[PDB]
Each structure stands twice: as structure tokens, then as C-alpha cells.
């Protein structure tokens, strides 16, 4: 049971919020590419 | 601050004459077109007339016989000498500047600044 | 809200139909500054606040 969130202490000025469908011996392999091009 | 102030309204007998003013502040009439518009209690804004910067006058063609728009550029004021005020001449008379320049959107009336308007009523007393 | 405590809502990540607002006869005042009201549907906007 997930009952512990300790990632932030505050959230002041938001510009973008987006709620989506879930993306997700070692059994799974997850590859991601993150790029910052022209914003 | 660009502000239009009208004065001269009130009670007026039938068949008489009544002079209205549009003493303007914040701008001059040497480069702006100025209009007079009336407002009936049961109807919308009805355009009466227009004074151009060169002295050119145009009027409502159903109202030409009894209105006169003049300027006094020394006192930067507009005049409206109305005569023969009848029952349907009861109106709240706004004086407004025409927008011949840049218009940020579609205007139904084409006025960039309005006046507070003065109310004229015609009855027995 | 009251005017001293005016509410602000962010509009984002959606498609906005401004043709139903400008053609609506409910609004007595509709004054747009810096953009034409008929050109609103042809532009894409960032940081929309109401
Ligand atoms: C960012 O947050 C601070 C503190 O909450 C606030 O004073 C400031 O006005 C905010 N700036 C913007 C652009 O929202």
C-alpha cells in the first residue's frame, strides 16, 4: 500500500499541468528519451 | 485623461429652442471627428449628427430640420442648438468622439470615448 | 467572486471555441485588446487566464 509521498514541500507558480494514462529477475525493460528542443 | 462632459439639459416647452453643450477636456477638435447621439427611453441609441475637423457638418436625414452642430475651438467645446422639441425629442443626449484610427475590435457605434450625456424631457411643465 | 478577491482560473490543454462567446447575445460588453475577436479561433495561445 502506497502511503508515503516525500518529494516536495511547496508548489507556488504553476504554468502547465497534464494528467494522462499510465506509461508503465528483472522482467520489464523501459526505454525513455527526453529532449529539450525549442521549448 | 480624455473625458467628455455635457451640460444644458432639463425641462423645455413644446415648440421652443434649447442649446446643449459638449465642453471637452483632454483633447481638441482640430484633428478629431465628434458625434451627437440620442437615446430614447424605449429605443436604442439613435445617431443625430457629426462635426468634422474642417467644419463639415452631417446630420440624421430624418432630423436635419431641427438640429445644428457648431464648434467653439477657442473654448474647445461643441454646441447643439436644437429647435421645436416635441414629445419624441425626450432623450438622453450623449456626445462622443468618432474612432477613425485603430479599432481593437468590431464596434457597433464606432466611438472610442463617450460622454455621460444630459437628459432632456418635453412635457406640459 | 467579489472584485477585491477576484477569482483566477487557468485555461490550458484544451481546444477553445471563441465563436460561441462572440456570437452569443448574452454578453452586453465584449471588448478585445490586441487581438481581433474573429481571429481568435485562428490563433493558438499560451498562458490563458480567466
Ligand atoms: C511566484 O510565487 C511568488 C510566491 O508565491 C509570488 O510572490 C510571485 O508573484 C509569483 N510569480 C508569478 C509570476 O506568478
The domains located in chain B, with CATH, are: 3-122 (2.60.40.10)
Widest Cα–Cα separation across chain B: 46
CA–CA dist C20, C10 (Å, integer): 19
Task: State how far the Cα of B3 lies from the Cα of B23, in Å rounded to an integer.
Answer: 9
Element (H, E) at B96: strand B91-98
Q: C31 and B104 in contact by Cβ < 8 A?
A: yes
The Cα of A27 is separated from the nearest Cα of chain C by a number of Å equal to: 35
What resolution in angstroms, rounded to 1 decimal?
2.7
**CA-to-CA distance for B80 and B115, rounded, in angstroms?**
14
C33 alpha carbon – ligand 1 mean position (Å): 25
User: Is B65 an interface residue toward C (CB < 8 Å)?
Assistant: no
Report DSSP state, residue B54. T
**CA C30 from chain center: how many Å?**
10
Q: Do chains A and C touch (3 or more CB pairs under 8 A)?
A: yes
The residue among B107, B102, B95 whose CA lies nearest residue C31 is B107
Q: Which residues of A touch C10 (CB under 8 A)?
A: 14
Q: Beta strand B118-122 with B10-12: parallel, antiparallel or unpaired?
A: parallel
Our measurement of the distance from residue B64's CA atom to the centroid of its chain's CA atoms, rounded to an integer in Å, reads: 13
What is the three-class DSSP state of C39? Answer: helix
By the 8 A CB rule, do B68 and B78 touch? no
B57: Cβ contacts below 8 Å, ≥ 6 apart: B49, B50, B51, B69
Nearest chain C residue (CA) to B104:
C33
Closest alpha carbon within chain C to A16: C12
Give me the residues of A, 1-39, that contact C with CB < 8 A. 14-18
Q: Which helix (H) or strand (E) holds B24?
A: strand B17-25
Of B47, B95, B111, B25, nearest in space to C31 by CA:
B111
Contact yes or no for B20/B82 (Cβ under 8 A): yes
CA atoms of C22 and C30, how far apart (whole Å): 7
Q: With contacts defined as CB-CB under 8 Å, which chain C residues touch A16?
A: 12-13
Q: Which of B107, B104, B116, B93 is nearest to B3 (CA)?
A: B116
Distance CA B6, CA B24 (A): 8
Amino acid at each position: 500500500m502506497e502511503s508515503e509521498f516525500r518529494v516536495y514541500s511547496s508548489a507556488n507558480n504553476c504554468t502547465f499541468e497534464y494528467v494522462s494514462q499510465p506509461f508503465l529477475n528483472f522482467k520489464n525493460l523501459r526505454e525513455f528519451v527526453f529532449k529539450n528542443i525549442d521549448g | 485623461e480624455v473625458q467628455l462632459v455635457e451640460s444644458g439639459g432639463g425641462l423645455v416647452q413644446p415648440g421652443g429652442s434649447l442649446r446643449l453643450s459638449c465642453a471637452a477636456s483632454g483633447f481638441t477638435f482640430d484633428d478629431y471627428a465628434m458625434s451627437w447621439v440620442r437615446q430614447a427611453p424605449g429605443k436604442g441609441l439613435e445617431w443625430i449628427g457629426r462635426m468634422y475637423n474642417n467644419g463639415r457638418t452631417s446630420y440624421n436625414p430624418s432630423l436635419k430640420s431641427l438640429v445644428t452642430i457648431s464648434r467653439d475651438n477657442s473654448k474647445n467645446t461643441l454646441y447643439l442648438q436644437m429647435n421645436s422639441l416635441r414629445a419624441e425629442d425626450t432623450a438622453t443626449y450623449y456626445c462622443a468622439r468618432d474612432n477613425l484610427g485603430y479599432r481593437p475590435s468590431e464596434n457597433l457605434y464606432g466611438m472610442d470615448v463617450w460622454g455621460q450625456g444630459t437628459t432632456v424631457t418635453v412635457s406640459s411643465s | 467572486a467579489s472584485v477585491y478577491a477576484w477569482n483566477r482560473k487557468r485555461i490550458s490543454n484544451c481546444v477553445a471555441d471563441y465563436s460561441v462567446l462572440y456570437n452569443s447575445a448574452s454578453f452586453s460588453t465584449f471588448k478585445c485588446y490586441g487581438v481581433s475577436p474573429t481571429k481568435l479561433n485562428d490563433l493558438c495561445f499560451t498562458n490563458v487566464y480567466a
